[PDB]
Design a protein around this ligand. Sequence first.
Ligand SMILES: [Cl-]
Ligand SMILES: [Cl-]
Ligand SMILES: [Cl-]
Ligand SMILES: [Cl-]
Ligand SMILES: [Cl-]
Ligand SMILES: [Cl-]
Ligand SMILES: [Cl-]
Ligand SMILES: [Cl-]
Ligand SMILES: [Cl-]
Ligand SMILES: [Cl-]
Ligand SMILES: [Cl-]
Ligand SMILES: [Cl-]
Ligand SMILES: [Cl-]
Ligand SMILES: [Cl-]
Ligand SMILES: [Cl-]
Ligand SMILES: [Mg+2]
Ligand SMILES: [Mg+2]
Ligand SMILES: [Mg+2]
Ligand SMILES: [Mg+2]
Lengths: 284, 284, 284, 284
Amino acid sequence: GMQIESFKSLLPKYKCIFFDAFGVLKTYNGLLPGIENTFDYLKAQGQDYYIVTNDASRSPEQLADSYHKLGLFSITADKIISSGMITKEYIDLKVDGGIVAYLGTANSANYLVSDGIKMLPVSAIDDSNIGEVNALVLLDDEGFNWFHDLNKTVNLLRKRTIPAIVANTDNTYPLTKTDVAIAIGGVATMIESILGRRFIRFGKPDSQMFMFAYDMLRQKMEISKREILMVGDTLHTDILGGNKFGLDTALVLTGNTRIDDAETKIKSTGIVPTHICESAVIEL
Amino acid sequence: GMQIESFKSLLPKYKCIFFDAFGVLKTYNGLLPGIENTFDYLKAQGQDYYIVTNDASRSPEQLADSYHKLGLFSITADKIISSGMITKEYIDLKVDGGIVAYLGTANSANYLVSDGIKMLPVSAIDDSNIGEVNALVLLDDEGFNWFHDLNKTVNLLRKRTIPAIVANTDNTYPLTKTDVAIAIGGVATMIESILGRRFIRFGKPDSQMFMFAYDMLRQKMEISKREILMVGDTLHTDILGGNKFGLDTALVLTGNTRIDDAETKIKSTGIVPTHICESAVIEL
Amino acid sequence: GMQIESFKSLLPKYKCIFFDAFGVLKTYNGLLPGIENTFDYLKAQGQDYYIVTNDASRSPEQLADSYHKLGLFSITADKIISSGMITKEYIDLKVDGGIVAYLGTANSANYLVSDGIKMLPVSAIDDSNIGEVNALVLLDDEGFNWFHDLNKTVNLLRKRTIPAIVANTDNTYPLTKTDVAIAIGGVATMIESILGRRFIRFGKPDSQMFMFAYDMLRQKMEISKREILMVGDTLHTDILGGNKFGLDTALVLTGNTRIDDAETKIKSTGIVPTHICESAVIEL
Amino acid sequence: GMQIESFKSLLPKYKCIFFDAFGVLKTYNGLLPGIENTFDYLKAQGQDYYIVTNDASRSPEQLADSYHKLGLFSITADKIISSGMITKEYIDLKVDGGIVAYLGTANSANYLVSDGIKMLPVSAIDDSNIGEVNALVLLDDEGFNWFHDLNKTVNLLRKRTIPAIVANTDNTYPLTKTDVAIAIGGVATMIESILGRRFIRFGKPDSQMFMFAYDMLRQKMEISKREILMVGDTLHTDILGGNKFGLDTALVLTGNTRIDDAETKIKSTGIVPTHICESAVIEL
Ligand SMILES: [Cl-]
Ligand SMILES: [Cl-]
Ligand SMILES: [Cl-]
Ligand SMILES: [Cl-]
Ligand SMILES: [Cl-]
Ligand SMILES: [Cl-]
Ligand SMILES: [Cl-]
Ligand SMILES: [Cl-]
Ligand SMILES: [Cl-]
Ligand SMILES: [Cl-]
Ligand SMILES: [Cl-]
Ligand SMILES: [Cl-]
Ligand SMILES: [Cl-]
Ligand SMILES: [Cl-]
Ligand SMILES: [Cl-]
Ligand SMILES: [Mg+2]
Ligand SMILES: [Mg+2]
Ligand SMILES: [Mg+2]
Ligand SMILES: [Mg+2]
């Protein structure tokens, strides 16, 4: 049996909320209806929050602009902790000049541009420049010819002893009510089905992003990890990750974990959320 | 230590040879030089042979035509036993009319054309005809847009309770001296990394093709399974497959199993060949 | 969709029935009540049967004797086709003298012996004789010390280039209504989790036992693949194997596939039985 | 390419060294000869150290005592960061009273003892106490009967929705020059081969222990991630974890990564250490 609790009822226990984005705040057809009231509410209550997301397809500033376009003005770039920030820091620290090859769009790659390094798509790599490729990043499922560039990526990683990096996204994402699409994490998975495990994956259920947020909160208040709530739709990323780091966790049913499957999934993985809620929408 | 034996020196022990094609008779740049003499030799000695191949991208007649183009005229379509034959028989028997969806080229699909069923590429499947799709076959890595149609195949299989069939090819094939290409079996492998295991795979190391050839030999001579030699470059398909069926096996070193790696791969898999030879090419 | 049919109604189409044993003829509770009616009916109708089983824990004669002890005298050793028989033949034809080491009971091992072979349990292997050990077979989850001999097995296979062989059983089997036990196939799975894929697996869904039965039947009568029904409770062994070999398949719901899960398991695997039936027990 | 450097030459960059223990400070043969020099030198230079180890079979105090018994007094309990400490914290913060079941020895369970939870071995769990079991921990590959308690463990986890917890050890460890033993992490791996992924795994390559050490250091001094070197013998735990956390890494060749295999293993994994050294043992 599941005890379903209202999200509003939980909020007084916590000094900060960590929200996953997809399946929690928004879905394939935009924001979940009413989700603005959640952020109005937290503001009115003076409650801190962050978005903690395994999206490295654009910068925090751009992720924040997408919410502003959808009308959620409360969410600023400083509130968005994304695994792309980890990737960027890893490249700056661990890659010594040359070229970083990427699978994705030019826009996805612009966030990573820096001094000393040239970003190039996999499509632009051949024998004439392969010796300068010092890393591979997988950023977005769109923006390149798969037949051409998945093939080239396989050969690039056979020929160059370099880090291959992706955000730990789900393997697929919902595109319509009926259809899913293969995500950038899934493109890595498919590559790894041919080559073996090979990708450094950043993001949940790792705890670096959580530690960053936690540290920033500790700079301005008394707070312990159990006084933070991680809110997510996915057991093996949001809930598992939150739990390992010591966060309380709330599973919402508006995403990857459907109500009919929750007990079964919880029982097969042994990943137990602190709380289960229908959704993160607070009714006005 | 490996005992390397001349292929010629083994031939007297055997009443029929089964040859894998790729890595044994031919490679990325055509026929292995001299392989013509092997076939001249077997004729002059009156020794039977078949080619037993997991290539289901063409009919046996077209597979034979490819050898004719390359100058190997003695290879006839009756000597080519291909996993595409199994696929064809499976469709005829187990699929009841409607549409068979495919990933490949129109030419790869032609061999499977039959009464009652329409072959269509996954690209031509939509809500208007999906309810009539009764099987999916993976035939060739070329001939379709991977971004579009790998996504559509994921969704097709999520929506239709139908058999998904592929030839059990290696996940990759050599394209040049340095580069490989993802093969149709590898495409299935990639799909399966997203969906889970889901493809019915035909061909080596299964034993149906062997049994078909064996039964034909038995109709014209006294022969036991150990009097047949399976010749291949791949442990987990040719050598494992042959051994399990009772055939003697000869590992050649002209393909997937490189000489520097043979002892290690043999030890790590426990797949032991009866004999190890440098190649299937016979001299003089 | 999920259409259940009468098993008895199906049977006049066929000259021979192949039955899986566990979950079909019997469960942890012993014989399925009334299963004798089925065999009496087939005998009255002039229909043949064979048992096709991946239980290779004892000889066909002892497997038959175990039915006799339970009061089912219609099953005789000459009608039991066990994957143990493939193992025995492999040892005879593909292992050249020396020792064949085993995990199991002495009773499971000794009858596998043939001229030139010595069976030995793993517990008896040492530096002095490891050199003579020419194969490993896993026969029964009982009969050895797990701590000592799973460790010794791991080392044996790291040190010796030998085939490692097991019946393709499910990983676990029901002991009681609530509890399962790890089966011998599961022990192999566990070892492969440490070492990687390493075991030759005999039995369903491979075609070898099916071919043997079919060969024998065709000597005694005019029989096609259209006149043989394969009856099983497990999709990925019984149903998949039968389908690939060209047989009609009947999934029964007295074993691994429960009525409440059948539709979803068929959908997820894409393994579609020709017919679904509650039981292989007929009335009257 | 593979450039070996002097370990001692590296050390002046750093304010603190994090050492892995097995394969770095000691092997199956005991302490690496001369390893005391290394700690003497760091102390002389005013440099700090911590041990960062996925050995959670004993408490930090017992782990330090084991060094003292071998004559290495420079390692003290307060400098040992063990993944056992994360397990302890997880049990305290996330497990609400009741029983914690364990696989291991009584001594290994001892440090986990707390006010509110009873420790009991899996062997002690039956129908009378099972509803009170609120977690399982795997602690040590010794101390239990594998046949009875691995079977019981599989049933325990099938029946109770509880977290299953293990240190992320390698699957095996060396006993002697020729033989390995299955480690506690490998036992979890085996269980997961039967049940599917099911264990929470603590330790490298996770960031948690790294974060702890760093948090402690930054209280006592001005220290950045650029002034900490992680030293280990295993790519997928030590080097990978160190790198993802933003640390310089040193691969040493005294343990799991041998000098003959380093270049190949680095190439296949894409896990690249900042530095490669023969040994953490310095001269003088
Ligand atoms: Cl997200
Ligand atoms: Cl692989
Ligand atoms: Cl990773
Ligand atoms: Cl993270
Ligand atoms: Cl071929
Ligand atoms: Cl080739
Ligand atoms: Cl999956
Ligand atoms: Cl298959
Ligand atoms: Cl076949
Ligand atoms: Cl059975
Ligand atoms: Cl006996
Ligand atoms: Cl050997
Ligand atoms: Cl096999
Ligand atoms: Cl350690
Ligand atoms: Cl974990
Ligand atoms: Mg989500
Ligand atoms: Mg080949
Ligand atoms: Mg069964
Ligand atoms: Mg180590």
